[PDB]
Amino acid sequence: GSSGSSGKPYKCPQCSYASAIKANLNVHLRKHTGEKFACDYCSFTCLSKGHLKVHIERVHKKIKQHCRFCKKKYSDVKNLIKHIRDAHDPQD
Ligand SMILES: [Zn+2]
Ligand SMILES: [Zn+2]
Ligand SMILES: [Zn+2]
């Protein structure tokens, strides 16, 4: 059948790494260790801080935002922005 000569079945849940041995997968994961930026919305994690931010702008995008000025929640942040410029419109 299709499945003939398979290899590198073990995949890394941290990156697109692979190996033909479990042990290897373990030692390989050790390298990933270090800086782990977890999401402040879900059980998500990333090595690149810059990326983590995007995860929220793509996953948790348009989340109930609470105005730090009038403690007013807004279904769509987009609006919250205009609001501040409307009600909380600065002199500058
Ligand atoms: Zn890896
Ligand atoms: Zn998240
Ligand atoms: Zn406000």
Curated annotation (Swiss-Prot):
Tell me the residue numbers annotated for binding Zn(2+) 2.
Answer: C12, C15, H28, H32
Q: Could you tell me the superkingdom of the organism this chain comes from?
A: Eukaryota
| Compartments, as annotated in UniProt | Nucleus; Cytoplasm, Cytosol
- Positions of Zn(2+) 3 binding: C39, C42, H55, H60
Annotated positions binding Zn(2+) 4: C67, C70, H83, H88
Tissue-specific expression: Isoform 1 is strongly expressed in placenta, spleen, kidney, testis and peripheral blood leukocytes. Expressed in CD4+ and CD8+ T-cells, CD19+ B-cells and CB14+ monocytes. Isoform 3 is strongly expressed in placenta, ovary, tonsil, CD19+ B-cells and CD14+ monocytes.
Cite the residue ranges of zinc fingers (C2H2-type).
10-32, 37-60, 65-88
Q: What does this protein do?
A: May be involved in transcriptional regulation. Overexpression causes down-regulation of a number of genes involved in the immune response. Some genes are also up-regulated.
Q: What is this protein called?
A: Zinc finger protein ZFAT
The protein's organism comes out as Homo sapiens (Human)
Gene name of the encoded protein: ZFAT
Span within the full-length protein is: 297 to 381 of 1243
